[PDB]
């Protein structure tokens, strides 16, 4: 079949800056008789349905604001936005009408800016958890940026990937930042056989990881 690619996967833009998207296919989508390149540009608002914007890459659909200007022909394509607004935060897609099956893009999600410094907050397992037959050691990572961050779990100096779950939500509109929760589950027998529980996270802006620990006694 025919495959398409979008690069890059994500872009962080501020208010007033222009943004350009690129959709490259595996072969020329140009049709000779109609002399029109068949491609579709979508914008999907969060919690809503996607909608078409630029049809046949050469024109703007009626009702779409002037900031959306389509261009490109043959292989390469470009979606140019003159000035972004507060309602321009969404994910974009790229569809081809050339041949079946219809190929869909990987998607590109916009972000905001900038400079969010995270922190580590540790909590011990509760009293009702150990009664139920298990234990959970979690530390919350909130107010950070960008969305790319790595967290490690080391028990008594030994690194363990068993029971590691992460929870990553969308970007909060108030502080323009992200919050991620990490959950590590273990039974009541493993809680009594171990003492120190640590979670270690690495951030690009920080030259050294932030470590936090607590004791069972």
């Amino acid at each position: 079949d025919i495959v398409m690619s979008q690069s890059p996967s994500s872009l962080a833009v501020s208010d007033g800056e222009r943004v350009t998207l690129t959709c490259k296919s595996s072969q020329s989508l140009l049709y000779s008789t109609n002399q029109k390149n068949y491609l579709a540009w979508y914008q999907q608002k969060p919690g809503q349905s996607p909608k078409l914007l630029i049809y046949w890459a050469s024109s703007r659909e009626s009702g779409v604001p002037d900031r959306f200007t389509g261009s490109g022909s043959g292989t390469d394509f470009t979606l140019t936005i003159s000035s972004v607004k507060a309602e321009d935060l969404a994910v974009y897609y790229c569809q081809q009408y050339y041949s079946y099956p219809l190929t869909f893009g990987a998607g590109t999600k916009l972000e905001l800016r900038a400079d969010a410094a995270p922190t580590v907050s540790i909590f011990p397992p509760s009293s009702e958890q150990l009664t139920s037959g298990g234990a959970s050691v979690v530390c919350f990572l909130n107010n950070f940026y960008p969305k790319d961050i790595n967290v490690k779990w080391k028990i008594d100096g030994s690194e363990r990937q068993n029971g590691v779950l992460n929870s990553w939500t969308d970007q909060d509109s108030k502080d323009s930042t992200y919050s991620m929760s990490s959950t590590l589950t273990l039974t009541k027998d493993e809680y009594e056989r171990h003492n120190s529980y640590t979670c270690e996270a690495t951030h690009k802006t920080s030259t050294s990881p932030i470590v936090k620990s607590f004791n069972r006694n």
């Binding site: 049809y55 099956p101 869909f104 999600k109 909590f123």
Partner: protein, 214 residues
């Protein structure tokens, strides 16, 4: 314009069948064409197939072969999409794509189909409090754990929804056919631990609401 009226959310089990209806109004149903799009892992759209109600032509993708069928109804002007032999990878959000003009394609509200084998259970609330007596930070954090609930979602409020500031609600994760979420808030060192708060959760399906003090 066109009003696309779909069905509600469906909760089924793997191995059963499910029907999704798409209602069209305002134009001729036998003129234009019908399509369906599935959204996989929430950021990625997948093309299911398409049907021309005029001549009743049916085509499908390679992945959706021998799985979903498409039937139309001339009297009610409705489009039917039925699935067979469901799996755990078939749980996603489905869209009804009606192609009228090449300028703009009309889209519906979406259909959330969650296919899993589980029994409705009341949620379990585990409170969280820091174990340190003093700290250099003027802002202290609290947390509330909600485990063993189904189906999703559930509405979590802090102090009967009185505190709307610094509320971080994390999405649910799926483990052993059960869902688990976490929530954390920022509290100043003046009120903590001077006053007590609570974690209020509400489950509309089981009508079970549990309150715990922190």
């Amino acid at each position: 314009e066109v009003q696309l009226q779909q069905s509600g959310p469906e909760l089924v089990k793997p191995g059963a069948s499910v029907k999704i209806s798409c209602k069209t109004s305002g134009y001729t149903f036998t003129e234009y064409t019908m399509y369906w799009v599935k959204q996989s892992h929430g950021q990625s759209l997948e093309w299911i197939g398409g049907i021309n109600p005029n001549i009743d032509d049916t085509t499908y993708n390679q992945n959706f072969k021998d799985k979903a069928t498409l039937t139309v109804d001339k009297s009610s002007s409705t489009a039917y999409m039925e699935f067979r032999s469901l799996t755990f990878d078939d749980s996603a959000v489905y869209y009804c794509a009606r192609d009228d003009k090449a300028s703009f394609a009309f889209w519906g509200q979406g259909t959330l189909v969650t296919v899993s084998a589980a029994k409705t259970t009341p949620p379990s609330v585990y409170p969280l409090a820091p174990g340190s007596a003093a700290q250099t930070n003027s802002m202290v954090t609290l947390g509330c754990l909600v485990k063993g609930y189904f189906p999703e979602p559930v509405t979590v409020t802090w102090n009967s929804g009185s505190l709307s500031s610094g509320v971080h609600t994390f999405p649910a994760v799926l483990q052993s056919d059960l869902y688990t979420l976490s929530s954390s808030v920022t509290v100043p060192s003046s009120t903590w631990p001077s006053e007590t708060v609570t974690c209020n959760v509400a489950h509309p399906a089981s009508s079970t609401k549990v309150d715990k003090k922190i």
